[PDB]
Swiss-Prot record, chain A:
This is Small ribosomal subunit protein uS9. Keywords: Ribonucleoprotein, Ribosomal protein. Residues 108-118 have a biased composition (Basic and acidic residues). Residues 108-135 are annotated as: Disordered. The keyword Lipoprotein does not apply. One of its GO terms (biological process) is maturation of SSU-rRNA from tricistronic rRNA transcript (SSU-rRNA, 5.8S rRNA, LSU-rRNA). It comes from Pyrococcus abyssi (strain GE5 / Orsay). It comes from the Archaea. GO terms for cellular component: cytosolic small ribosomal subunit. Belongs to the universal ribosomal protein uS9 family. InterPro entries: Ribosomal_Su5_D2-typ_SF (IPR020568), Ribosomal_uS9 (IPR000754), Ribosomal_uS9_archaeal (IPR019958), Ribosomal_uS9_CS (IPR020574), Ribsml_uS5_D2-typ_fold_subgr (IPR014721). Residues 119-135 have a biased composition (Basic residues). Pfam families: Ribosomal_S9. GO terms for molecular function: RNA binding; structural constituent of ribosome.
From Swiss-Prot, chain B:
InterPro entries: Ribosomal_uS7, Ribosomal_uS7_arc, Ribosomal_uS7_dom, Ribosomal_uS7_dom_sf, Ribosomal_uS7_euk/arc. Signal peptide: none annotated. The keyword Ribosomal protein applies. One of its GO terms (molecular function) is structural constituent of ribosome. This is Small ribosomal subunit protein uS7. Belongs to the universal ribosomal protein uS7 family. Pfam families: Ribosomal_S7. One of the primary rRNA binding proteins, it binds directly to 16S rRNA where it nucleates assembly of the head domain of the 30S subunit. Is located at the subunit interface close to the decoding center. It comes from the Archaea. GO terms for biological process: translation. The keyword Cytoplasm does not apply. Keywords: Ribonucleoprotein, Ribosomal protein, RNA-binding, rRNA-binding. GO terms for cellular component: small ribosomal subunit.
Swiss-Prot record, chain D:
Part of the 30S ribosomal subunit. The keyword Ribosomal protein applies. Gene3D superfamilies: Winged helix-like DNA-binding domain superfamily/Winged helix DNA-binding domain. Belongs to the eukaryotic ribosomal protein eS19 family. May be involved in maturation of the 30S ribosomal subunit. This is Small ribosomal subunit protein eS19. Keywords: Ribonucleoprotein, Ribosomal protein. One of its GO terms (cellular component) is cytosolic small ribosomal subunit. One of its GO terms (biological process) is ribosomal small subunit assembly. The keyword Ribosomal protein applies. The gene is rps19e. One of its GO terms (molecular function) is RNA binding. It comes from the Archaea.
Swiss-Prot record, chain E:
GO terms for cellular component: small ribosomal subunit. This is Small ribosomal subunit protein uS10. InterPro entries: Ribosomal_uS10, Ribosomal_uS10_CS, Ribosomal_uS10_dom, Ribosomal_uS10_dom_sf, Ribosomal_uS10_euk/arc. One of its GO terms (biological process) is translation. Pfam families: Ribosomal_S10 (PF00338). SMART domains: Ribosomal_S10 (SM01403). Belongs to the universal ribosomal protein uS10 family. GO terms for molecular function: structural constituent of ribosome; tRNA binding. Keywords: Ribonucleoprotein, Ribosomal protein. Part of the 30S ribosomal subunit. It comes from the Archaea.
Length: 135, 214, 111, 144, 102, 56, 148
RNA sequence: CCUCCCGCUCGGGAGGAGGCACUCUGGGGGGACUGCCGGCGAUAAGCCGGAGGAAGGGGCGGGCGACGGUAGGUCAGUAUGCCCCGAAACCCCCGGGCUACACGCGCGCUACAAUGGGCGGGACAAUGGGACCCGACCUCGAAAGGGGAAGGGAAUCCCCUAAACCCGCCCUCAGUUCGGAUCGCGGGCUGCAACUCGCCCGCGUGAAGCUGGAAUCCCUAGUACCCGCGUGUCAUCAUCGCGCGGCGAAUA
């Protein structure tokens, strides 16, 4: 068989993925892909897996562990890594360029994540000032 | 819950929100073709960051554009499952997360009556809710005019979707029109150009006041 | 029930422990934990007045004492902050604070 | 061919809560829904399901965790209390529905207290579950 | 022999690394088996403070860092092979803890 | 006349009036309790010798 | 169903609506929304159905769980007033007992000459602090208890 | 390899051996510089557009604020010229006052419901703080809390549960099951002591408010908008100040 370990990181959901051959396993943090309640962020994970095909999804075991705060955050870290897990597998430029033309959230993360809350002039949030009315 | 999972087998294949094929519709006008993300795929939430570039906001999934101009109204106050709200408004004093549900149930409530691919009723409601002419109180050379200004396909879309999203919250106001409904009964009647769309009443008036002034 | 409690007399004979089940959470606490060394010199001047050595007119800065059944009858002089304001203590005053009855402000109209 | 891992938590909970009516060892005591309930409830419900869900969770949670305490399961529910116009804050549930529940499971032989100081599953609590999940995961492939 | 832990922290970056490196160099060659100098966290300490003593207008607010870094070292040597290695000069300002177990 | 000593003798078990600094000798003004009891104003003057860093 | 009515009379002659049983009793002063669902149990009814679907026989089971609730069950912190005026163990409160018991204790304090009774006469919260400018722009709390 | 469960015997999951791969931790090194390509520009400076690429043309966010001035602000933090007090404008003490209110405004929180409420279930973080201090876990108590007690001066233990989310169920738009003021009572907790003047828990009580004139403020992207989370100071008053991550735009 094989072991190709990859990563996928979006807004600090770090997905730890492994792609070995088998029988159609989809593991997320220990639980099948079935346990999630929002239908929505599931479909996001599902986007790459059809762009390539069910053929390669069925023939390969994917276990990922996404330690990330967001529900959509987890999903997004799962969308970037499967796509990178499937481009290392087959090896061709056909599956890589087909992802890039569709969206760059499969193969690029961000350049940025979050900004600090500025000291500010005694109010709440990074970018805000106390209200004025002294004119 | 079982239909819900069929809604997970079906978007896979590929279709928006679980059961709307993105090929059902076409953009017949060559004006609204590059300005609309009908053609690309699956999820609005995306977080693909826009306004990054000059037109980093044209490539925005039509529905995502819907979600956050449908999310708009919002201050200060605090929401959680507790006792707890409003804080997420008559238009998300809060997130695109519980916004995306409203637009999904409004695609469900507009499909239930019309029975068409609802992405053929909304893309038929954002080519009609946009006025074709606008007057700006524009002065140039120190000389105050109120003038013929024609509208650009990007600034069209925006006035289409925003006037759709502004009309519904006057009606949903402390009323049985739920936004999942009040939006679904705005999107049908902006598609039709009906005399019941607070969004096709400004479209017209903004062209008609602007014709007088020209 | 006229007169607060079982009867005015039976609550002078139940003092430590048995009153407690009747009282508020707040009155219990200050009896049960105890009160300060100025509250110990005020148990001589209620006792000089009921019997014996020449009685002083009882004065107090005690505004944290909650009225008991034995102290019902005496005319208690509670310093409002400037001067001593009198209170003839009743059996309907069992269970209230002593600093309620004397004022914490002069009482006039606002304007 | 199933664990509590393989079944969604919306289909697992009415299948274990029924299997807590049926067996029929765990039951509602009368004092626990009446007025000894968890924090504040907009209404108090007169449900068997109410008791059978607060326990159907307890057999899933001790599976995942080792030393799962009373102070953990009181704080694990999710729910608040008003202070006023001051915004709400995070408080914990009623320890009465959690300290009788573990002990109704403890007499049933589903949970046991370990000698390290804590709460773990027995084999009888672990098999009661894997059978109920083998029935749920089998039904989830039949149903489009 | 006696497995000793040298747990060595310092308030600044330059002072902590020189000692950690020197401890792994001198111990290397004698009657010592030594496990490598492992870096644990910086419990960066934030003191977040009001500048202005008026507390008036806009007051610009100082962010403070105290960063304290902790290297850890297991070693298999005697109590006599330990002092030989604890000879070293050490920056001001570098805490060196010693636990002793068999 | 004659009387016994005084250097204050009332309760000051806890609060701000319990504290004083080791540089400007105050009760109500700031007392940073990390084992560095000073006011906020001293703190600013003292820190570069402490080894705190301005940079965020 | 158990014989439709739109107005059955419960708790004396005061009226039971067609909203829901748990909300129809809340109105009847003395029975709230938590105390309504404590007397649905003892009596043996479905709590979530409409009010007015009651024969004559259900209306008698509620009026005797009200007169003395501390006889049927109802814990000694889950009953309306526990430990009353220093010598009643527990009682019930209803539109006539609640109105009288609260004006009595207020009649008691004014004679006592306290800082609670005259603070309920001038127009003020006693422990809520600010009277500084709240109830602002001519406004008013309405103190206790009803401006509907 | 080994212990436990389940099974359609194909196969799913946990523990410990075992293994440092991965995440991560903190120390060091490379990578972006208009380098290249086109257009505009005096072939210069520079601006625009393009390709390759994780990232681009101040990459992005902070700290970093000259000579001075408003006689701005503070001698009520300290330092200090001058003046004034001297059983006092000192000193000690208890109690009361700063928390008084017919009202006016500023800055904010909470809020006028179906994008909703109850109930249940399930999937998810980060900064931090923790010795008369964080407190596992076990027990009693409806709960607030009390009794017992492990670990921890810290990547190794504890606060700790994130919240928003979603799925099913009950409920079916009224000043209400909204909203929580006000008042009665029962009860805990700290301190000598919470009436004046603390917070929470339970039952009863259940006020204004059903989208707000003139006028006016804040901000330009991982930002605003939104959701919780921690810390400071610290017994206790936080709808505050500082700071963290989760969802994630409009227009320019």
């Amino acid at each position: 068989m094989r072991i190709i370990q990859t990563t996928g990181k979006r807004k600090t959901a770090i997905a730890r993925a492994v792609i070995r051959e088998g029988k159609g396993r989809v593991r997320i943090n220990g639980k099948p892909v079935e346990i999630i309640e929002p239908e929505i962020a599931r479909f996001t994970i599902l986007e790459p897996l059809i762009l390539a095909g069910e053929e390669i999804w069925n023939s390969v075991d994917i276990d990922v562990k996404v330690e990330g705060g967001g529900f959509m955050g987890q999903a997004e870290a799962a969308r970037m890594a499967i796509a990178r897990a499937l481009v290392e597998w087959t090896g061709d430029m056909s599956l890589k360029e087909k992802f890039m033309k569709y969206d760059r959230t499969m193969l690029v993360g961000d350049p940025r994540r979050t900004e600090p809350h500025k000291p500010n002039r005694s109010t709440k949030g990074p970018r805000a000032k106390r209200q004025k009315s002294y004119r | 819950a079982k239909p819900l999972n069929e809604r997970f087998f079906i978007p896979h294949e590929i279709k928006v929100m679980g059961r709307w094929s993105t090929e059902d519709v076409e953009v017949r006008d060559p004006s609204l073709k590059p300005y609309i993300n009908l053609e690309p795929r699956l999820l609005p939430h995306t977080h693909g960051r826009h306004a990054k570039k000059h037109f980093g906001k044209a490539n925005v999934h039509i529905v995502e554009r819907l979600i956050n101009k449908i999310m708009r109204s919002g201050g200060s106050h605090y929401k959680v499952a507790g006792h707890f709200m409003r804080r997420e408004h008559r238009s998300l004093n809060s997130k695109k997360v519980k916004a995306y549900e409203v637009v999904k149930e409004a695609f469900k409530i507009i499909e239930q009556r019309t029975g068409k691919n609802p992405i053929q009723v909304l893309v038929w409601a954002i080519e009609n809710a946009a006025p074709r002419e606008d007057t700006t109180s524009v002065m140039f050379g120190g000389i105050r005019y109120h003038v013929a200004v024609d509208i650009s396909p990007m600034r069209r879309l925006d006035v289409a979707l925003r006037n759709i999203a502004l009309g519904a919250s006057a009606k949903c106001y402390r009323n049985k029109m739920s936004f999942a409904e009040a939006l679904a009964e705005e999107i049908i009647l902006a598609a039709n150009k009906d005399p019941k769309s607070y969004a096709y009443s400004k479209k017209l008036e903004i062209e008609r006041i602007a014709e007088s002034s020209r | 029930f006229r007169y607060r409690g079982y009867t005015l007399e039976q609550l002078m004979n139940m003092s430590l422990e048995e009153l407690a089940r009747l009282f508020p959470a707040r009155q219990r606490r200050s009896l049960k934990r105890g009160l300060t060394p100025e509250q110990k010199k005020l148990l001589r001047k209620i006792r000089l007045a009921k019997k014996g050595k020449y009685k002083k007119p009882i004065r107090t800065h005690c505004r944290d004492m909650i009225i008991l059944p034995e102290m019902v009858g005496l005319t208690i002089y509670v310093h409002n902050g400037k001067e001593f304001v009198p209170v003839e203590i009743k059996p309907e005053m069992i269970g209230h604070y002593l600093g309620e009855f004397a004022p914490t402000r002069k009482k006039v109209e606002h304007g | 061919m199933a664990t509590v891992y393989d079944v969604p938590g919306d289909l697992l909970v009415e299948r274990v809560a029924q299997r807590l009516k049926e067996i029929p060892e765990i039951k509602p005591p009368e004092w626990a829904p009446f007025v000894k309930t968890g924090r504040h409830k907009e209404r108090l419900p007169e449900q068997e399901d109410w008791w059978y869900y607060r326990v159907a969770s307890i057999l899933r949670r001790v599976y995942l965790d080792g030393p799962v305490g009373i102070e953990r399961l009181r704080t694990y529910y999710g729910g608040r209390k008003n202070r006023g116009h001051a915004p709400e804050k995070f408080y914990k549930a009623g320890g009465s529905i959690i300290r009788k529940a573990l002990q109704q499971l403890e007499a049933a032989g589903f949970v046991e207290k370990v000698p390290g100081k804590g709460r773990v599953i027995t084999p009888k609590g672990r098999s009661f579950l894997d059978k109920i999940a083998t029935e749920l995961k089998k039904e989830l492939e039949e149903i489009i | 022999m006696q497995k000793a832990r040298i747990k060595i922290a310092s308030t600044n970056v330059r002072s902590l690394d020189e000692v950690a490196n020197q401890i792994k160099q001198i111990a290397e060659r004698t009657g010592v088996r030594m496990s490598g100098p492992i870096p644990l966290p910086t419990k960066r300490i934030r003191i977040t403070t009001r500048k202005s003593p008026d507390g008036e207008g806009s007051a610009t607010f100082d962010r403070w860092e105290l960063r304290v870094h902790k290297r850890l070292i297991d070693i298999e040597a005697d109590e006599r092979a330990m002092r030989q290695i604890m000879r070293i000069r050490v920056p001001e300002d570098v805490t060196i803890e010693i636990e002793l177990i068999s | 006349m004659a009387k016994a000593d005084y250097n204050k003798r009332k309760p000051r078990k806890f609060g701000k009036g319990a504290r004083r600094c080791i540089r400007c000798g105050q009760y109500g003004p700031i007392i940073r309790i990390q084992g560095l009891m000073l006011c906020r104003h001293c703190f600013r003057e003292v820190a570069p010798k402490l080894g705190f860093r301005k940079y965020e | 169903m158990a014989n439709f009515r739109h107005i059955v009379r419960v708790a004396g002659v005061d009226l039971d609506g067609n909203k829901q049983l748990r909300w129809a009793l809340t109105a009847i002063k003395g029975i709230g929304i938590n105390f309504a669902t404590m007397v649905c149990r003892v009596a043996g009814l479905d709590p979530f159905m409409k009010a007015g679907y009651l024969t004559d026989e259900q209306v008698k089971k509620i009026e005797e769980i009200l007169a003395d609730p501390v006889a049927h069950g109802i814990p000694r912190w889950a009953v309306n007033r526990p430990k009353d005026y220093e010598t009643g163990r527990d009682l019930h409160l209803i539109t006539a007992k609640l109105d009288m018991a609260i004006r009595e204790d207020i009649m008691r304090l004014r004679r006592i000459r306290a800082y609670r009774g005259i603070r309920h006469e001038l127009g003020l919260p006693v422990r809520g602090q600010r009277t500084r400018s709240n109830f602002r722009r001519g406004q008013t709390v309405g103190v206790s208890r009803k401006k509907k």
